[PDB]
Design a protein around this ligand. Structure first.
Ligand SMILES: Cc1ncc(COP(=O)(O)O)c(CN[C@@H](CO)C(=O)O)c1O
Ligand SMILES: Cc1ncc(COP(=O)(O)O)c(CN[C@@H](CO)C(=O)O)c1O
Lengths: 418, 418
């Protein structure tokens, strides 16, 4: 008798909906740039009895009895994070990227202090100063964007904004930026205006880990990330720093500053995911992720689409939809209609509201995990192009649905499960 | 081939430490009052592919494609929460109790506003105004305590403190309070000083759900809880309110106010746990939890120990350790030494610091889940009494270890697993 057998017996409603979600993951092209398919091993840790343990504090410094094994697991997670990212300090307890970022803010700032991040419409995150997020509600958020000419960062301009605004904290790292970030230049800029420097590498963490993107850790005061995007782990957050005394302060801000008990089953999954990312296979995967994203971006360009910045250095791209006279909201719907899962996104200098947008964000990590190569991603580009160019055409619609089905059949997902 | 097989094959280190943690849970008396043993069904949801989905927003109002099944699951969680607690609104996304409470604060307060909760040393939570927590760092926290005479709440005195202090938010609900809370009197007090009223029922949520403790939902502005203590679910948080317009505001404060993507695998587990708590078996379990706690408290009293307040109405108790000339820190260690897992706790008006304390907190939920009855809890009381009364006696130590082993053998934990 298995845990899944108990679920079927005791909650057939939830059991059935879970089976539908597995079918759904199998039978769609998952192109949301922040998604991935985590391993069977990771999922086993999340399904474990580790959920039952209260473990406030840190390994060997807990507020409860009985943490001897939890301490061993969390210490493996910490040690593998420090190995993977070349970091002197790591806190593996943040429940999410949002909570990792909040703990950093609690450490470095007081309410009302000024933060400077990327414009949300240009690729910055809600937690980097959106007025609907605590980061913009309780702090004074100012923004930099990309160049209207190159559609990428102009470091001279960023320095000019920093000098004018005098932020206490500068944030780099983004949700929708397709080029390499120069952390050395961010350090120069922070040093010049006396700001703290945070790199939020949630999206690119697996590329950092694999050596396919420069590492912010030696240069920044602190680095946050999620564990579940290109790092292909469970959902959760992570705080890294080159400064182990500062790391002690961040620990206090995670607990007792912002969280209670950590999710030790998730932390076991973080350990597992970090161990997988230490393997040579993961370096190859991460190279393939970028090759695949570039292939999809190039083929979209071949089909007449504008890619913001003219291409990509990483796992993602923004498709500007003027060439096809669609809003992001419309394009997102139209691709959902042919079993492609993405999300809309504002482009730099978007004429439309964020609830409408002019862009579609696409990424390669999830389908790269299923085994697709560059020519398979060129085929994905062609399916998307076909659908967006001929949105009223029913025969194109069904061709797209059939081409998606072929890709999904070729590249099974979790074939041992039902 | 199973997910656990993949874990063993790919990460024997983590696999082995996980197996040790299962053995540990089996072979200790787990008396931490905030712990439980969640079901195989719940653990199956946590181990599922639902970890792979980004689902910012709410059911049918998401910021990503592909949430059709996630929406069905989260809507089941919501509907079962509203059923179980008789609530007009529920948000099942908070990652933790701390995050549920923070989202409420973001909705109702601004930094600097005054909050009033139970003194931490008297049983209040870190998130109810500790100076080491955001709740006391960024808000003005004032406290009420219990009567030095009765060691329980004196509602006239609470009204006097509220009138003097004029808090914007009053918090009731506690981490270490062993008596019934009168939510009607808290409403009277809040109405009289024009304060919002939050009930944080994390500890007692399963007793509320089963009708063995009065329900705060009809009386309070908002109710927070965790899902993992007496509710016996996965680790996470929950926001309930009688006011569905207010509920919409709390939703915005969870996302995008304080969190990003929800943990949909955990949310599936919340649905399952709520479904289990709707069953008559859970009513019986919750009655047994209180009978068992009372049995342990009574037998400790028979062995000469002071129980704060003179007994318990719920799942927990605080043992005052003056009768045995020990600190909480010492008592906690001494019981760990005989395979009993608890935690130290300050008593009301404790002469010692919170890092030392004069108290041991004990609770019945976890061992009640394993099947123990009242006479078994009287035996637990006798083992603890023996150890604390004779801390230097090696023969008593081994008798205690052997008596713990007998209890654990009689009442197997998750016997289908290895
Ligand atoms: C009333 C209340 N509200 C909130 C929380 C926080 O829950 P979290 O651990 O899920 O953040 C707790 C946790 N309670 C833990 C201590 O943090 C305990 O062992 O008692 C609580 O007791
Ligand atoms: C840079 C950065 N930092 C933090 C977070 C928050 O992570 P969480 O969802 O775990 O809170 C995100 C999430 N990113 C989501 C949107 O929230 C996405 O689909 O892009 C992020 O991109």
């Amino acid at each position: 008798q298995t845990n899944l057998d108990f679920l079927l017996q005791t909650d057939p409603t939830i059991s059935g909906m879970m089976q539908k979600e597995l079918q759904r993951q199998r039978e769609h092209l998952e192109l949301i740039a922040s998604e991935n398919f985590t391993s069977p091993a990771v999922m086993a840790t999340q399904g474990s009895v580790l959920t039952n343990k209260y473990a406030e504090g840190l390994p060997k410094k807990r507020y409860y009895g009985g943490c001897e094994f939890i301490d061993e697991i969390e210490q493996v997670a910490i040690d593998r994070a420090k190995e993977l990212f070349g970091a002197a300090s790591a806190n593996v307890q943040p429940h999410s990227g949002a909570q990792a970022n909040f703990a950093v803010f609690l450490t470095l700032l007081k309410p009302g202090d000024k933060i400077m991040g990327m414009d949300l419409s240009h690729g910055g995150h809600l937690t980097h100063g959106s007025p609907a997020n605590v980061s913009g509600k309780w702090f004074e958020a100012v923004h930099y964007g990309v160049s209207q000419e190159t559609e990428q960062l102009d470091y001279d301009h960023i320095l000019e904004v920093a000098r004018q605004e005098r932020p206490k904290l500068i944030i780099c790292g983004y949700s929708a930026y397709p080029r390499i970030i120069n952390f050395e230049k961010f350090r120069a800029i922070a040093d010049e205006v006396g700001a703290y420097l945070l790199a939020d590498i949630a999206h690119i963490a697996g590329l950092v880990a694999s050596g396919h993107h420069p590492n912010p850790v030696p240069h920044c005061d602190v680095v946050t990330t999620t564990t579940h995007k290109t790092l292909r782990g469970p959902r959760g957050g992570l705080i890294l720093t080159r400064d182990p005394e500062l790391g002690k302060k961040f620990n206090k801000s995670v607990f007792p500053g912002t969280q209670g008990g950590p999710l030790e089953h998730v932390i076991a999954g973080k350990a597992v995911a970090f161990g997988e990312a230490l393997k040579p296979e993961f370096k190859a995967y991460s190279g393939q992720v970028i090759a695949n994203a570039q292939a999809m971006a190039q083929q979209l360009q071949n089909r007449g689409f504008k890619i913001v910045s003219g291409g990509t250095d990483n796992h993602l791209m923004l498709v500007d939809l003027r060439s096809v006279n669609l809003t992001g909201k419309q394009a997102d719907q139209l691709v959902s209609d042919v079993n492609i899962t993405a999300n809309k996104n504002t482009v730099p200098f978007d004429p439309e509201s964020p609830f409408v947008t002019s862009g579609l964000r696409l990424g390669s990590p999830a389908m790269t995990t299923r085994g697709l190569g560059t020519e398979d991603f060129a085929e994905i580009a062609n399916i998307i192009a076909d659908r967006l160019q001929n949105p009223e055409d029913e025969q194109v619609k069904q061709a797209c649905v059939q081409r998606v089905a072929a890709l999904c059949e070729r590249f099974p997902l979790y074939p041992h499960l039902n």
